[PDB]
Ligand binder design. Sequence first.
Ligand SMILES: C/N=C(\NC)NCCC[C@H](N)C(=O)O
Length: 213
Amino acid sequence: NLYFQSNAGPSIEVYVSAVSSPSRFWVQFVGPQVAQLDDLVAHMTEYYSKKENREAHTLRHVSVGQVVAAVFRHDGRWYRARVHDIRPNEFDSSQQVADVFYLDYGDSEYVATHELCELRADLLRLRFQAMECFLAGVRPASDKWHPQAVERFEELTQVARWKALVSRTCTYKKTATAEGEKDKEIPGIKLFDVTDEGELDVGAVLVAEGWAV
Ligand SMILES: C/N=C(\NC)NCCC[C@H](N)C(=O)O
């Protein structure tokens, strides 16, 4: 299930961009691709906000695993997302709803398939910014996490508020792949809110407040 890492590199700086729980969150690396991302959102948003452009990128078919353009309901801007699943709506037949994963951020929302657009191919150039992680060295106190544990983890990381943190990789878990192929590895990291005083260890705060062990 889970392996230790005797050869961690130097720690790096990241923003926590989305959280599901301490066992499953997404970071973006601090650096020049963030501003490239910013530029990309603005561009996609100016572009897909015109009808003419939506109609030249109307989806006649949509598939699970497909990368598309999608509005995020909380700000009305356009993002690159991957269709994770499609589910029916029994009260409206004109509307299947797609579970989409916002690839540069890591959150997932249900969007009506009607409002997705084909993603113009040049918009794939920039690397997908969201890296899945989990927090090393903690487990929930008897994703099996208590909701307020998750909540507090969102406060400590200041999820989605562009607060830079220091990340050290300590463990990992292997992810399965096509047979014979190399396995992927999700990193188990520790996060620190570094300052002149010293460091806030986010997981150590969770353990002390009784949310984790
Ligand atoms: C966290 N996931 C995002 N997109 C998929 N975020 C995009 C930016 C959200 C915007 N700042 C806002 O206030 O809504």
